[PDB]
Each structure stands twice: as structure tokens, then as C-alpha cells.
Design a protein around this ligand. Structure first.
Ligand SMILES: O=C(O)/C=C/c1ccc(O)c(O)c1
Ligand SMILES: O=C(O)/C=C/c1ccc(O)c(O)c1
Lengths: 193, 193
């Protein structure tokens, strides 16, 4: 039947053991899921040479995912949008197929603890019933400062797909978007303002 | 009926007018196509802070596209592969769909002029009858050296797609792969060896 993910028990790629030891409690709290047959789940990590709040200022902008994600043709939130849990956005993904819309709901937004997350609630693409959580974490050593971003998801494996089929695709997309996040926020950090 | 592409008559994004003026003859020679209704074509450019031959050493490796492209699960050329025009490779693309194979043929390989190109000759994906050409070009100013990579393609627009549907997708993939090429070759340059 259902099982618990083990992301919080091993070092994900792109994290050092030292970083993992500081983050294991956060991974248990925010990046653990109860999964069912036909679902898969992964945890990805990205080190960023910028302060936490600089990274968080970009991560938290639910209305502007194109600021750090690839393959976004457009994203609309409509008038009267407030940055509050329950809000939705309509994302049009660059897919090489006829353009549709992924409708996504903001599930979590904690500016104190630097946690956000969302669910895909409709849209006809390769990530059915996708739900993800992103957390942002600060590190220091001898006055030097960096950030780690953790992003996990659960998603349905489509009929005819292997788990590897779906997991490798979703991991690749998340990893590439985190690399964009790292580039964008490192530029913001180096330029101050 | 058929028309000629105009890539050689305007500055593509990511190129300066000065760079374009030095490259317009190469764009006419290597990045111009006769296209038909139902096809689209684009030219993309990427500046790289590395010497031409450093970039070319990576660009030319037809057997190892994963060295600079994203979304490659595997690539096989089989025993007795020689780097010669007419050779093929089997590329398995990370697609979130059940894994298949894009069979691709090496169309051009000129180590003197730094031109290569390939065609997708089978594979059941979003880039039917895709053909592309990549050229690598050196620039100098006051002893400083850089490279521009130009990559163009022609591809079929699937039934039900708009030209923008296909062109935005193919452009995004090419642009992201060129960014990876820039990162990989800039690292090779900075480390020498
Ligand atoms: O390629 C697909 O099949 C879907 C990709 C996708 C779907 C929803 C998003 O928010 C997003 O950034 C990417
Ligand atoms: O996403 C698709 O539909 C196909 C992508 C694709 C197809 C062939 C390649 O060589 C490649 O790098 C990517």
C-alpha cells in the first residue's frame, strides 16, 4: 500500500554530508510524503552563492515563476491577486504541442521559515497531480555565506510509463529550473541594490 | 510555395551588430534554407568566452551530444564508429513519455571551417524532419578573444500546431543547450589542459 519517502535519510545529490546534517530535520518536516503505487517522489538540491533572503525574494514570487523556471510561455494571476495561500496561477508551458494551461494552487507560503509549495490542479500534461515544496536554507563558515534550496515533489506515473520514465523527466526539469534560480539570484547578490 | 529564410538579413538575438557584420556571409552560406508551408526555421546565437578550438572540440563530438545538450538519457553509436559524414547515432531523449529513440545522421563535419550539422531521420517526437547546422566563429578585440556559436534548424510544424507552437519550443531547447555549451567550454578554457 502506501509508503513513506526516504529523502530525509540519505544525502541528495548536490548536497554535502555536512549540509545534510543541518537539513535533515527540515527534509523530514517539509520534504516527506506518503506515496501510493503509481506515484513517484524525488528531492533535489541546489547550492547558491547568495544570502537566504536574496534567494527567497525570487522563490516566493508565486505570480512570476518565469523569473526562475524555463519553458514558461506565460503566467497569469488576474486582477486582485494577493500573495496568499489558496491563490491560483494559470501557467502556459512551452511544450511543442498546442498550448494549454496548467492551473496551479499556492499551498504554502511561510516568509519566516522560507517554505513555499504548490499543486498542479489541472492541465493535461506529463505531471498529473504534481505537488511540490521548496525550502530555502542559510549556511555560514568563517564569515562566508551561502544558501541551499531544497525542492521535492510527488507526481503520478502515467499509464505506460515506468517510474524512471517520469522521475528522470521531473528531476531534469526541477534541476534545470534550480540552476536558473541559482544564476538569477547570484546575479542579484553580486549587484546588490 | 517555397521561400528562403531571412536569418542572414537581420541580427539574431544574442549577437551584436558588429558580430553580425562579420558573420553575415557565413549565415548566408550555412544557415539559409528553402522552406515549405508547414515548416519553420530559426537561427540562434550564443557568445562564449573561450577560444574557437576549445568550443569546436566539444561541438564536433557527434557521438557525445550529452556533453553539451540537456534531456539526453543516452546516446549510442555502436562499435566501429568513425567521425565521418553519414554516420548515425541513436539518442534517447528524456521526455516523461515512454522512452524511444531519435535516430540522427551526421550531415556535415568540416574541422577547418568549424561547421557541423545533423538530421533527425526517425524517432516519433516533436521535431519531425528536423535538420540543423552549427557553426563556430572567432572574434578578437585588443587581444581579447571570444567565440560565437550559430545554430539554425528547419523542422516540420505538426498538424494542430501553430508555427509559434513549434518554433518557441525548438528555440527554447536550442537556446538552453547552447547555454550548456557555453558553460562547459568556458570551464574547459579557464582550466587549460
Ligand atoms: O512538460 C510538461 O509536460 C509539463 C511541464 C510543466 C508543467 C507545469 C509547470 O508549472 C511547469 O513549469 C512545467
Ligand atoms: O522533446 C522532444 O519532443 C524531442 C527532443 C529532442 C529530440 C532529438 C534530440 O536530439 C534532442 O536533443 C531533443
Amino acid at each position: 500500500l502506501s509508503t513513506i519517502t526516504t529523502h530525509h535519510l540519505t544525502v541528495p545529490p548536490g548536497l554535502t554530508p555536512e549540509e545534510f546534517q543541518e537539513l535533515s530535520s527540515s527534509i523530514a518536516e517539509f520534504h516527506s510524503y506518503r506515496i501510493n503505487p503509481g506515484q513517484c517522489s524525488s528531492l533535489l538540491a541546489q547550492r547558491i552563492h547568495a544570502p537566504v533572503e536574496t534567494v527567497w525574494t525570487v522563490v516566493r514570487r508565486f505570480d512570476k515563476p518565469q523569473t526562475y523556471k524555463h519553458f514558461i510561455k506565460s503566467c497569469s494571476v488576474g486582477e486582485d491577486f494577493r500573495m496568499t495561500v489558496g491563490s491560483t496561477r494559470d501557467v502556459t508551458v512551452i511544450s511543442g504541442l498546442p498550448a494549454a494551461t496548467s492551473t496551479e494552487r499556492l499551498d504554502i507560503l511561510d516568509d519566516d521559515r522560507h517554505v513555499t509549495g504548490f499543486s498542479i490542479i489541472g492541465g493535461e500534461h506529463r505531471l498529473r497531480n504534481y505537488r511540490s515544496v521548496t525550502t530555502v536554507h542559510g549556511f555560514e563558515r568563517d564569515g562566508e555565506i551561502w544558501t541551499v534550496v531544497l525542492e521535492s515533489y510527488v507526481v503520478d506515473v502515467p499509464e505506460g510509463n515506468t517510474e524512471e520514465d517520469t522521475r528522470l523527466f521531473a528531476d531534469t526539469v526541477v534541476k534545470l529550473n534550480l540552476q536558473k534560480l541559482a544564476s538569477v539570484t547570484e546575479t542579484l547578490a553580486r549587484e546588490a541594490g
